[PDB]
Curated annotation (Swiss-Prot):
Residues carrying the site annotation Cis/trans isomerization of proline peptide bond: 89-90
Chain spans, region Interaction with human PPIA/CYPA and NUP153: 57-95
Localization, UniProt: Virion
Species name: Human immunodeficiency virus type 1 group M subtype B (isolate NY5) (HIV-1)
Complexes and interactors: Homodimer; the homodimer further multimerizes as homohexamers or homopentamers. Interacts with human PPIA/CYPA; This interaction stabilizes the capsid. Interacts with human NUP153. Interacts with host PDZD8; this interaction stabilizes the capsid. Interacts with monkey TRIM5; this interaction destabilizes the capsid.
The record's account of how the chain is modified after translation: Phosphorylated possibly by host MAPK1; this phosphorylation is necessary for Pin1-mediated virion uncoating.
Protein name, entry field: Capsid protein p24
Residues of the full protein shown: 133 to 277 of 1435
Gene name in the database record: gag-pol
């Protein structure tokens, strides 16, 4: 995750093993019930796309629910690319590139690019955009059972 220190510096930290343990144990009790969504939000404050992929990797054992989630992520990433069709390069040398759907999903972006977007002024909130797509997928799963 990104956290803000006392001087206002944005600081990256790797995801807590205790956050992953809590997320696994949460899913073991509430996998198909509405509470999985606010508990996912509670455990992903300031999460990068790489943190979010790490959280999903710890719970992939229920392959049919994970398949539904990954299909929803691919649908929302395709919709992002339709609204934001990528240019051949950035506006000028030294500017960050605009993220793709796969960059927001953390599959074609580096952690350093994710930190760059999330610590922009104002933030380019790729972690929160990916959380929205994950929460849409979690919604489909609890609707369906
Ligand atoms: C919405 C949703 C619904 C369900 C799920 N995952 C699952 O049910 N995983 C099943 C377990 S994973 C591997 C694992 C972690 C802990 C254990 C041990 N224990 C089986 C006692 O074995 C994921 C999402 Cl994202």
């Amino acid at each position: 995750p990104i956290v803000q220190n006392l001087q206002g510096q944005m600081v990256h930290q790797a995801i807590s093993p205790r956050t992953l343990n809590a997320w696994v144990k949460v899913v073991e009790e509430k996998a198909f019930s509405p509470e999985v969504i606010p508990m996912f939000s509670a455990l992903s404050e300031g999460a990068t796309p790489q943190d979010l992929n790490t959280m999903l990797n710890t719970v992939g054992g229920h392959q049919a629910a994970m398949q539904m989630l990954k299909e929803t992520i691919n649908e929302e990433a395709a919709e992002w690319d339709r609204l934001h069709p990528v240019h051949a390069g950035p506006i000028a040398p030294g500017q960050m590139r605009e993220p793709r759907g796969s960059d927001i999903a953390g599959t074609t972006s580096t952690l350093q690019e994710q930190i760059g977007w999330m610590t922009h002024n104002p933030p380019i909130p790729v972690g929160e955009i990916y959380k929205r797509w994950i929460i849409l997928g979690l919604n489909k799963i609890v609707r369906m059972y």
